Amino acid sequence: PISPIETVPVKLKPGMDGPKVKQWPLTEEKIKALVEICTEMEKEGKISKIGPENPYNTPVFAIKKKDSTKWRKLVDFRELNKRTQDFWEVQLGIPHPAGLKKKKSVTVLDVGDAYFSVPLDEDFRKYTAFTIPSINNETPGIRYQYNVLPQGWKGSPAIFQSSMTKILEPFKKQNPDIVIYQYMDDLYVGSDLEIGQHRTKIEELRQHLLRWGLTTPDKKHQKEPPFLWMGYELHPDKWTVQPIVLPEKDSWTVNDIQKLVGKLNWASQIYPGIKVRQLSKLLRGTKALTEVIPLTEEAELELAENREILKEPVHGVYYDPSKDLIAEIQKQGQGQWTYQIYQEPFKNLKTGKYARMRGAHTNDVKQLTEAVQKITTESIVIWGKTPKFKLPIQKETWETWWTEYWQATWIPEWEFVNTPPLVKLWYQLEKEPIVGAETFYVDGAANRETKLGKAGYVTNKGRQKVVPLTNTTNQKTELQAIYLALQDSGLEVNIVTDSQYALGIIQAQPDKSESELVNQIIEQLIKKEKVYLAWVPAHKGIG
């Protein structure tokens, strides 16, 4: 449909040649079924009859719509694709609705017969060769070649979108009042011109397009909102996720829990407090696809609350550059955090969650910063600027943590927001030992094979305890020991540990881990008034 359209020169991967995949014979009904689609096709110049020895062929296959209102031509370019150069990946990133700027009118455009409107590099034309059979050797097979973009080739979407961009560009510039967004075959136009003009301007666009062989049976701006796109319900001034369904089942299998978590994560964009720890905690699937897995107790409760949340429709608003971009986070609990980003008080821009990806240890302050981190990157992609954070932490707690933290961090501008839970250090270990405090030379190992060990201790004051454990590891006992030491000690204690392992676990001052031992030790640390763990080399170290 276009000589005025400039073709994008295409090439075959470095040392390869054009596809050669002979055509299987098809039903005679189809031969003409294609012959109809093809002569009216060659007629439209989209394709062209080709003479002998274009050694390259590709499979054609008349396909029934299954609604049989008419027939459809379909080519299998798999082999051509496998032989054509890479192109500039389009849509590698997709816009988030929460980042679209508040606009009045927005009208989509089903730019129809698009791939067949854009020309195709003359030279790359010879590989598009496909042959339609003539009823079992009756003739030299009706053989065609493509002059437009083959509807299923590799560089088609790209070359299309490229070409489009070039076509709009003129018009696009003759109108900074209109902004346009291309999406494959779609073309969403938006503006702030009184709806009367905007409808007059789309008329224009449309005509502009039209002069470029690009048609749009979509006149009046046919299709209306809410627009369905990449799974979003997009209304004039609001947006949301295309309704989801969390099925209720008797037995849950892996492929089942996965689409569930997927649906749940996805709804998290705008549905506040959606948790997913438990539902996933299950998926440490030694990836057995239909391995039937029984929802655990919490997973059953977790999914519950998600329903309570999901049932009730929640929407998200758009972006007004002229207003701030605020972000708030609130701790759920089992390493889970949730956040919503907003400009106004009641309607959100978007929401989301964050959880410390499985690693048996971490602190709330650490977790909160990782959260803040993810939000920052999200903000930069969506709005192009960091937001103002409102966080459940007090300058004193925060700044005291980043100062003692060995890793470097960057805390953008934030405000305190008193609204529990509260992020805080439930205990600080003593930097220098404690004078007078009974030192506990805590120790405890095990027999790697026998899975048996003992954790005990010996203090200055000649106090010695030794407890036996069955079914634990050197690691397990090393904390078992420390713990022990805390139990027996008074409210101030000095503990000498031989294991960095035990050291670090506690030194990071983790505030949690479902690892009941550390919990016990942690709970004990909070109770004391002065604790000092000090590390000393193992083997050689002491006696």
CB of 325 closer than 8 Å to CB of 387: yes
Residue with smaller CB distance to ligand ABZ, 1 or 190: 190
Q: Using CB under 8 A, which of 494, 497, 509, 524 touches another protein?
A: 494
Radius of gyration for the chain, computed over Cα atoms and rounded to the nearest angstrom: 33
- The residue count for the chain: 543
> What are the CA-CA distances from residue 413 to residues 50, 106, 387, 391, 417 (Å)?
67, 35, 8, 10, 13
* Site size toward another protein, by CB under 8 A: 71
Nearer to ligand ABZ, 343 or 513 (CB): 343
Contact assessment for residue 18 and residue 83, using Cβ atoms and an 8 Å cutoff: yes
Which of ligand ABZ, another protein, none interacts with 234 (beta carbon under 5 to 8 A by kind)?
Answer: ligand ABZ
- Residue with smaller CB distance to ligand ABZ, 76 or 204: 204
| DSSP state string for 266-295 | HHTTTSTT---HHHHHTT-----TT-B---
| Site track for another protein across 29-68, x = CB under 8 A | ----------------------------------------
What's the closest the beta carbon of residue 88 comes to another protein, in angstroms? 5
186 is in an annotated binding site: yes
Spatial CA neighbour of 454 closest among 440, 470, 441: 470
Residue 377 interacting partner from ligand ABZ, another protein, none (CB closer than 5 to 8 Å by kind): another protein
Helices 516-527 and 474-488: crossing angle in degrees, nearest 10, is 30
- Give the nearest distance from C-beta 380 to another protein in angstroms: 5
What residue has token string 């100062």? 403
Three-state DSSP at 131 gives strand
Task: Identify what 165 binds: another protein, ligand ABZ, none; CB under 5 to 8 Å per kind.
Answer: another protein
Strand order in the sheet with 238-241: 227-229, 232-235, 238-241
Q: Which is nearer to another protein, 195 or 542 (CB)?
A: 542
- With binding defined as CB under 6 A, does residue 161 bind ligand ABZ? no
Please tell me whether 511 is known to bind a ligand.
no
Element (H, E) at 182: strand 178-183
Which one of another protein, ligand ABZ, none interacts with residue 338, CB within 5 to 8 A by kind? Answer: none
What are the residues whose beta carbons fall under 8 Å from the beta carbon of 373, sequence distance 6 or more?
none
Ligand-binding annotation for 121, yes or no, is no
Distances, alpha carbon 520 to alpha carbons 133, 367, 511, 512, 524, in Å: 78, 21, 11, 10, 6
Among the residue ranges 97-105, 359-367, 421-429, 473-481, the one whose residues contact ligand ABZ (CB under 6 A): 97-105
258, 246 Cβ separation under 8 angstroms:
no
Of residues 143, 18, 23, the one with CA closest to residue 81: 18
Place of tokens 């009118």: 105
Question: Is residue 110 annotated as involved in ligand binding?
Answer: yes
Upstream peptide bond of 226 is cis (omega within 30 degrees of 0)? yes
Instruction: Establish whether 256 is an annotated binding residue.
Output: no
Which of ligand ABZ, another protein, none binds 327 (CB below 5-8 Å, type-dependent)?
none
Binding mask of the shown chain, residues 266 to 305, with x at each position contacting ligand ABZ by CB under 6 A: ----------------------------------------
Tell me the closest approach of the beta carbon of residue 291 to another protein, in angstroms: 32
- Binder of another protein out of 62, 158, 279, 485 (CB under 8 A): 158
Between residue 71 and residue 90, which ones bind another protein under the rule CB under 8 A?
85-90
User: Could you tell me if 105 and 97 are in contact, meaning their C-beta atoms sit under 8 angstroms apart?
Assistant: no
Is 396 annotated in some ligand binding site? no
**How far apart, in Å, do the first and last CA atoms of the chain sit?**
89
Q: Which of 37, 47, 60, 106 binds ligand ABZ (CB under 6 A)?
A: 106
Does 246 participate in binding another protein (rule CB under 8 A)?
A: no
By CB under 6 A, name the one of 32, 42, 61, 95 that touches ligand ABZ: 95
Which one of residues 4, 9, 231, 490 is an interface residue with another protein (CB under 8 A)? 9
Q: Is 2 in the site for another protein (CB under 8 A)?
A: no
CB 264, min distance to ligand ABZ, A: 22
Torsion sign, CA atoms 306, 309, 312, 317: negative
Q: Which lies closer to ligand ABZ via its Cβ, residue 100 or residue 521?
A: 100
Number of residues that bind ligand ABZ (CB under 6 A): 14
With CB under 8 A as the contact rule, the residue among 184, 283, 301, 536 that binds another protein is 536
Say how far apart CA 279 and CA 381 lie, in whole Å.
29
Say whether residue 127 binds another protein (CB under 8 A): no
Phi-psi region of 325 (alpha: psi -120 to 50; beta: other; left: phi over 0): beta
108 binds ligand ABZ (CB under 6 A): yes
Contact 47, 144 (CB under 8 A): yes
Q: Minimum distance from CB of 93 to another protein (Å)?
A: 4
Q: Reduce the DSSP state of residue 528 to 3 states and report it.
A: coil
Question: Binding of ligand ABZ at residue 310 (CB under 6 A)?
Answer: no
- List the binding residues: 110, 185-186, 443, 478, 498
- List the binding residues for Mg(2+): 110, 185-186, 443, 478, 498
Footprint of ligand ABZ on this chain (CB under 6 A)? Answer: 95, 100-101, 103, 106, 108, 179, 181, 188, 190, 227, 229, 234, 319
